[PDB]
């Protein structure tokens, strides 16, 4: 990634540290940011014997892989589109992950330039 | 004891080719550089100054130690080889057969009978061979460990039992 080069070898003050952010408020710059949704209640995900590290938002697409795999036994190549369906939403929320990483980065650049601009202006 | 100067050259040459074989690996290159190695040997052969030779040996082996392979090639059945006394576990001294139970001894009748012939023959020839040993000791004690051969007729070489009856290198 170019982010490490821009941080360690570049202006580290303008690079969002993964541990630091989220720092800015959700709606800061976002008029009516909409909350995430969870179709599956924690009861069934708990019931589905799903790992906590796997107990994410996209786990709602995971709970039926094991069901169909159990029904597909012994045929292990039955669920292909369904398995593909889960890893797609994995991609989508993963895609969400660096856009918000960049969103806070762009906010960081925007705030930093604004403060310097007004500092010399005032 | 005394390792003559031409002997050490022979040993150094032998170890050089073994090390050169390990470095070259491939046969045609092995024959290539060994001939070059040979070519740089025979031309320093007609020197009348022994001081030159020992001085030559100095930096020559100093070159040998620097250029030695950190993992030289040894055949498995030699000191450092992968089969060094790996068959020593199976070998057993011959005298242990005297402890065998008579039922076991009777289960190998003819061989044990031949063992008796070897035992009796060694018992008889022991007096003759020790007498020969004491009769030709160099003055002032034994000068060298080399054993003298059986001189007369109808005898056996002195101090022969263990070397002749040593367990085979392939005992199983």
């Amino acid at each position: 990634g170019a982010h490490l080069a821009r941080r360690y070898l570049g202006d580290a003050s303008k690079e969002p540290d993964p541990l630091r952010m989220p720092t800015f408020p959700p709606d800061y710059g976002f008029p009516e940011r909409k909350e995430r949704e969870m179709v599956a209640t924690q009861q069934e995900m708990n019931d589905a014997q799903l790992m906590l590290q796997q107990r994410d938002y996209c786990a709602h697409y995971l709970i039926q892989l094991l069901k169909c795999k159990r029904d597909s036994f012994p045929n292990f190549l039955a669920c292909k589109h369904e398995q593909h369906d889960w890893d797609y939403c994995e991609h989508l929320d993963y895609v969400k992950r660096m856009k918000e990483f960049e969103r806070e980065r762009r906010l960081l650049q925007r705030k930093k330039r604004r403060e310097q601009r007004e500092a010399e202006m005032a | 004891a005394y390792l003559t100067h031409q002997q050490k050259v022979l040993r150094l040459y032998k170890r050089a080719l073994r090390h050169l074989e390990s470095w070259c690996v491939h046969r045609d290159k092995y024959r290539y550089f060994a001939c070059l190695m040979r070519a740089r040997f025979d031309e320093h052969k007609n020197e009348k100054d022994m001081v030159k030779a020992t001085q030559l040996l100095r930096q020559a082996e100093e070159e040998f130690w620097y250029g030695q392979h950190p993992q030289p090639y040894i055949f498995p059945e030699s000191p450092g080889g992968t089969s060094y006394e790996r068959y020593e576990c199976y070998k057993v001294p011959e005298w242990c057969l005297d402890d065998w139970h008579p039922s076991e001894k009777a289960m190998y009748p003819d061989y044990f009978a031949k063992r008796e012939q070897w035992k009796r023959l060694r018992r008889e020839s022991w007096e003759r061979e020790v007498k020969q040993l004491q009769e030709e000791t160099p003055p002032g004690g034994p000068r060298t460990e080399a054993l003298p051969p059986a001189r007369k007729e109808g005898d056996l070489p002195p101090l022969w039992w263990h070397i002749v009856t040593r367990p085979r290198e392939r005992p199983m």
Binding site: R7, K34, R36, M38, Q42, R55, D56, Y57, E100, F101 | -
Partner: protein
């Protein structure tokens, strides 16, 4: 069998008794030497050159081929250290100090940049793992009676 006259005794003070001490260890006066008279209790036992059993020539026949000692030759005071199985002092191809320099260099070389590797850790230009139900506070052992701190993420 063995008598009291041939046995380890006191430090060789006079050369005449040093000659007797040499014969005591079936060795000659010119090469015979004792341990330093440090009061450590070595007595007259010689300190032979510190050569392990591997240094001995294997092709030469030994009365004890497994450990390469002949009969009656006065063995080293510390044979158990220098036996074939135990500690050895065979000459390595490269010098010991160079052995230490490169080895101690490598471990410090390996360790030091691992610290600066932690100073600048490698990651992805990516955000953190979001999680629902207040980042699974209830399912991570959190007390249900204790009010879960409201945590919930949005879209972008």
């Amino acid at each position: 069998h063995v008598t009291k006259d041939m046995f380890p005794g006191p430090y060789p003070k006079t050369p005449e008794e040093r000659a007797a001490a040499a014969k005591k260890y079936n060795m000659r006066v010119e090469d015979y030497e004792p341990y330093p008279d440090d009061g450590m209790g070595y007595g007259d036992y010689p300190k032979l050159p510190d050569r392990s059993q591997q240094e001995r020539d294997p092709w030469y026949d030994w009365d004890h081929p497994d450990l390469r000692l002949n009969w009656g030759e006065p063995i080293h005071w510390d044979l158990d250290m220098y036996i074939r199985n135990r500690v050895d002092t065979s000459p390595t191809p490269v010098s010991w100090n160079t052995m230490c320099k490169h080895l101690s260099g490598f471990v410090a070389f390996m360790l030091f940049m691992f610290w600066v590797g932690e100073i600048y850790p490698s990651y992805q230009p990516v955000g953190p793992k979001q999680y629902p139900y207040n980042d699974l506070y209830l399912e991570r052992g959190g007390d249900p009676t204790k009010e879960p701190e409201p945590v919930v993420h949005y879209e972008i």
